[PDB]
Design a protein around this ligand. Sequence first.
Ligand SMILES: Nc1ncc(-c2ccc(C(=O)N3CCC[C@@H]3CN3CCCC3)cc2)nc1NCc1c(Cl)cccc1Cl
Length: 290
Amino acid sequence: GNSYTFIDPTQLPYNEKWEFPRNNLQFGKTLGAGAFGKVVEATAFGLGKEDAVLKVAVKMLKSTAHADEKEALMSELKIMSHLGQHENIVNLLGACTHGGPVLVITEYCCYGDLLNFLRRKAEADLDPLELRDLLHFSSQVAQGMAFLASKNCIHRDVAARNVLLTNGHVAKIGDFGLARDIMSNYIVKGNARLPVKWMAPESIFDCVYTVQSDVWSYGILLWEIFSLGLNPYPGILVNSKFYKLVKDGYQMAQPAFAPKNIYSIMQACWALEPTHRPTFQQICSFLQEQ
Ligand SMILES: Nc1ncc(-c2ccc(C(=O)N3CCC[C@@H]3CN3CCCC3)cc2)nc1NCc1c(Cl)cccc1Cl
């Protein structure tokens, strides 16, 4: 057939350069968990050219996991290994694929997730975040998305809860559990629990994902950032009523700390036609100037 084809990174064998011995690894406390597995804190000894002793985060499935889920963690590993590094992504540091279950090792971000961070500040002030800081988080997530978009990697789980804050409070997009690689649609296979309040209409109603779907999600995140971590569509349950509102063009109101320019960016991300939404690169231009 045609001698030229795009290379599907999920089809590539595991790259052995990421391999790290599990006995150079010491597990600590659980950072987050589910039914799929967990992410734990660990100390890595002699990892890469980094600090000889290095605090890292490690993802693993619970021993209960079936063939389905083990394969989904390898796909995740494979996607993350082809991306290359960026300053605003929770980068992959290595893996453990021999001598035991699959472990995926990534940068440890000491201040945890953005959502909880924003909520602690909101609770502390009731008992100090500035607009500049909120803009910086927004701009940094945008930069990471633009990098992902430029790899044809659609994240599919853009939310304050999946943005993490590392040294200097630098924002990084984490959790690639639903990340997928395209090229030009991605169609939803089905029945995975999904983050409905962060999903673009075409993803809900047509099971279709493009990079412009992530832009919708990013707009929701902007709403989360500038409201200091309110749940989206506050007080409105996911049901028939919600889907109607979304399809008929309902949008959340301007949050307390969002300047008009940022709300306008939000609203443009919430265009029903995905191609009428701005690109992540354009969004980087907007926030670099604000
Ligand atoms: N790669 C990571 N690096 C750090 C953390 C991480 C580190 C600490 C806390 C935390 O909960 N901390 C940090 C200050 C406040 C809070 C206090 N904890 C101490 C005891 C209970 C909560 C939360 C996450 N997680 C990572 N990956 C897992 C993950 C992703 Cl990729 C996305 C969303 C959630 C998660 Cl868990």
